[PDB]
């Protein structure tokens, strides 16, 4: 069933016991922290075996 | 506890796993801050059931 | 609410 990705992440915030408005009011910070954290996986795997 | 949904002309709230549309009200919903922050927020009426009761 | 709508 399709759902917009920010609304799926708001359901996942409810699943950890954080209210949905915490995601919608911080959405750009949460997206940046995710994009940054994937960049660290990329760098660590690029760095060492 | 639900998701906001539209049939094209009207806005409802439903439970997430089964389509059961209800009118959007001050007891179906909670407030947090102003309209300027949320990406993709929409303008619609929220009905307040107390106001016609005070109008009795 | 109905006891309060007495006032
Ligand atoms: C969206 O849902 C609303 C339900 O409120 C529909 O509006 C009703 O439509 C019937 C048939 O035309 C009318 O008899 C009612 O009086 C309408 N109620 C209200 C409050 O307007 C509406 O038709 C639906 N829209 C679409 C595009 O399906
Ligand atoms: C969805 O994209 C439209 C432009 O196509 C934009 O106006 C709107 O703000 C976007 N909404 C969300 C929830 O991303
Ligand atoms: C919602 O209402 C405000 C009131 O200032 C208006 O500026 C805006 O164009 C309306 N529509 C949307 C989609 O925000």
GROMACS .gro file of C-alpha atoms and ligand atoms in nm:
model
  168
    1UNK     CA    1   0.000   0.000   0.000
    2UNK     CA    2   0.166   0.332  -0.095
    3UNK     CA    3   0.225   0.594   0.178
    4UNK     CA    4   0.441   0.914   0.160
    5UNK     CA    5   0.785   0.842   0.316
    6UNK     CA    6   0.765   1.122   0.579
    7UNK     CA    7   0.424   0.980   0.689
    8UNK     CA    8   0.571   0.628   0.711
    9UNK     CA    9   0.851   0.771   0.932
   10UNK     CA   10   0.587   0.947   1.148
   11UNK     CA   11   0.420   0.602   1.202
   12UNK     CA   12   0.766   0.465   1.303
   13UNK     CA   13   0.811   0.751   1.555
   14UNK     CA   14   0.470   0.654   1.704
   15UNK     CA   15   0.599   0.291   1.715
   16UNK     CA   16   0.895   0.395   1.943
   17UNK     CA   17   0.665   0.609   2.166
   18UNK     CA   18   0.759   0.954   2.024
   19UNK     CA   19   0.461   1.169   1.907
   20UNK     CA   20   0.420   1.223   1.524
   21UNK     CA   21   0.458   1.604   1.541
   22UNK     CA   22   0.820   1.553   1.662
   23UNK     CA   23   0.899   1.415   1.315
   24UNK     CA   24   0.693   1.665   1.110
   25UNK     CA   25   0.836   1.962   1.310
   26UNK     CA   26   1.199   1.829   1.275
   27UNK     CA   27   1.172   1.659   0.932
   28UNK     CA   28   1.470   1.833   0.762
   29UNK     CA   29   1.698   1.765   1.063
   30UNK     CA   30   1.591   1.394   1.072
   31UNK     CA   31   1.648   1.365   0.693
   32UNK     CA   32   1.993   1.533   0.722
   33UNK     CA   33   2.096   1.308   1.016
   34UNK     CA   34   1.994   0.999   0.810
   35UNK     CA   35   2.172   1.118   0.489
   36UNK     CA   36   2.484   1.197   0.701
   37UNK     CA   37   2.471   0.857   0.881
   38UNK     CA   38   2.453   0.669   0.544
   39UNK     CA   39   2.757   0.878   0.431
   40UNK     CA   40   2.949   0.739   0.735
   41UNK     CA   41   2.865   0.378   0.627
   42UNK     CA   42   2.993   0.462   0.276
   43UNK     CA   43   3.318   0.617   0.415
   44UNK     CA   44   3.383   0.331   0.666
   45UNK     CA   45   3.335   0.058   0.397
   46UNK     CA   46   3.543   0.267   0.150
   47UNK     CA   47   3.820   0.296   0.418
   48UNK     CA   48   3.874  -0.062   0.553
   49UNK     CA   49   3.830  -0.438   0.484
   50UNK     CA   50  -0.477   0.749   1.613
   51UNK     CA   51  -0.527   0.746   1.235
   52UNK     CA   52  -0.436   0.922   0.909
   53UNK     CA   53  -0.590   1.224   0.728
   54UNK     CA   54  -0.748   1.124   0.397
   55UNK     CA   55  -0.953   1.283   0.117
   56UNK     CA   56  -1.206   1.145  -0.133
   57UNK     CA   57  -1.120   1.447  -0.359
   58UNK     CA   58  -1.359   1.713  -0.214
   59UNK     CA   59  -1.384   1.636   0.163
   60UNK     CA   60  -1.126   1.559   0.437
   61UNK     CA   61  -1.167   1.275   0.689
   62UNK     CA   62  -0.963   1.086   0.948
   63UNK     CA   63  -0.949   0.702   0.928
   64UNK     CA   64  -0.793   0.424   1.133
   65UNK     CA   65  -0.482   0.311   0.937
   66UNK     CA   66  -0.563  -0.058   0.856
   67UNK     CA   67  -0.933  -0.038   0.752
   68UNK     CA   68  -1.120   0.240   0.568
   69UNK     CA   69  -1.365   0.403   0.816
   70UNK     CA   70  -1.384   0.783   0.752
   71UNK     CA   71  -1.485   1.022   1.033
   72UNK     CA   72  -1.530   1.403   1.041
   73UNK     CA   73  -1.214   1.580   1.165
   74UNK     CA   74  -1.274   1.715   1.518
   75UNK     CA   75  -1.090   1.861   1.821
   76UNK     CA   76  -1.120   1.512   1.988
   77UNK     CA   77  -1.005   1.313   1.678
   78UNK     CA   78  -0.692   1.538   1.668
   79UNK     CA   79  -0.425   1.718   1.875
   80UNK     CA   80  -0.267   2.065   1.818
   81UNK     CA   81   0.107   2.132   1.795
   82UNK     CA   82   0.229   2.480   1.702
   83UNK     CA   83   0.161   2.685   1.389
   84UNK     CA   84   0.104   2.616   1.015
   85UNK     CA   85   0.448   2.747   0.895
   86UNK     CA   86   0.664   2.443   0.996
   87UNK     CA   87   0.502   2.123   0.856
   88UNK     CA   88   0.593   2.024   0.496
   89UNK     CA   89   0.270   1.950   0.301
   90UNK     CA   90   0.008   2.066   0.560
   91UNK     CA   91  -0.342   2.147   0.410
   92UNK     CA   92  -0.611   2.406   0.500
   93UNK     CA   93  -0.936   2.246   0.627
   94UNK     CA   94  -1.206   2.300   0.896
   95UNK     CA   95  -1.176   2.115   1.230
   96UNK     CA   96  -1.517   2.082   1.402
   97UNK     CA   97  -1.537   2.154   1.780
   98UNK     CA   98  -1.831   1.958   1.937
   99UNK     CA   99  -1.862   2.185   2.246
  100UNK     CA  100  -1.955   2.501   2.049
  101UNK     CA  101  -2.312   2.394   1.939
  102UNK     CA  102  -2.357   2.248   2.293
  103UNK     CA  103  -2.289   2.596   2.445
  104UNK     CA  104  -2.526   2.726   2.170
  105UNK     CA  105  -2.815   2.521   2.331
  106UNK     CA  106  -2.087   1.800   3.000
  107UNK     CA  107  -2.467   1.798   3.066
  108UNK     CA  108  -2.445   1.895   3.441
  109UNK     CA  109  -2.213   2.184   3.335
  110UNK     CA  110  -2.465   2.297   3.065
  111UNK     CA  111  -2.707   2.343   3.359
  112UNK     CA  112  -2.480   2.653   3.419
  113LIG     C1  113  -1.675   1.293  -0.041
  113LIG     O1  114  -1.749   1.251   0.078
  113LIG     C2  115  -1.865   1.335   0.114
  113LIG     C3  116  -1.930   1.273   0.238
  113LIG     O2  117  -1.965   1.377   0.330
  113LIG     C4  118  -1.961   1.341  -0.006
  113LIG     O3  119  -2.063   1.444   0.020
  113LIG     C5  120  -2.200   1.396   0.029
  113LIG     O4  121  -2.244   1.350  -0.103
  113LIG     C6  122  -2.385   1.305  -0.114
  113LIG     C7  123  -2.411   1.267  -0.260
  113LIG     O5  124  -2.382   1.379  -0.347
  113LIG     C8  125  -2.479   1.415  -0.062
  113LIG     O6  126  -2.613   1.362  -0.052
  113LIG     C9  127  -2.438   1.462   0.078
  113LIG     O7  128  -2.528   1.569   0.120
  113LIG    C10  129  -2.292   1.510   0.077
  113LIG     N1  130  -2.253   1.556   0.211
  113LIG    C11  131  -2.180   1.665   0.231
  113LIG    C12  132  -2.143   1.697   0.377
  113LIG     O8  133  -2.144   1.738   0.139
  113LIG    C13  134  -1.892   1.380  -0.136
  113LIG     O9  135  -1.989   1.366  -0.243
  113LIG    C14  136  -1.768   1.293  -0.164
  113LIG     N2  137  -1.696   1.342  -0.282
  113LIG    C15  138  -1.649   1.263  -0.378
  113LIG    C16  139  -1.568   1.333  -0.488
  113LIG    O10  140  -1.667   1.142  -0.377
  114LIG     C1  141   0.470   1.725  -0.282
  114LIG     O1  142   0.516   1.782  -0.408
  114LIG     C2  143   0.447   1.909  -0.442
  114LIG     C3  144   0.493   1.951  -0.581
  114LIG     O2  145   0.472   1.840  -0.671
  114LIG     C4  146   0.477   2.012  -0.332
  114LIG     O3  147   0.401   2.132  -0.357
  114LIG     C5  148   0.436   1.958  -0.193
  114LIG     O4  149   0.478   2.054  -0.091
  114LIG     C6  150   0.498   1.821  -0.164
  114LIG     N1  151   0.442   1.767  -0.039
  114LIG     C7  152   0.511   1.683   0.038
  114LIG     C8  153   0.435   1.623   0.158
  114LIG     O5  154   0.627   1.653   0.015
  115LIG     C1  155  -0.387   2.826   0.342
  115LIG     O1  156  -0.422   2.950   0.412
  115LIG     C2  157  -0.318   3.055   0.407
  115LIG     C3  158  -0.370   3.175   0.489
  115LIG     O2  159  -0.272   3.281   0.489
  115LIG     C4  160  -0.289   3.090   0.259
  115LIG     O3  161  -0.178   3.182   0.252
  115LIG     C5  162  -0.251   2.965   0.178
  115LIG     O4  163  -0.236   3.004   0.038
  115LIG     C6  164  -0.358   2.856   0.193
  115LIG     N1  165  -0.327   2.734   0.117
  115LIG     C7  166  -0.225   2.653   0.141
  115LIG     C8  167  -0.219   2.525   0.056
  115LIG     O5  168  -0.141   2.678   0.227
   0.00000   0.00000   0.00000
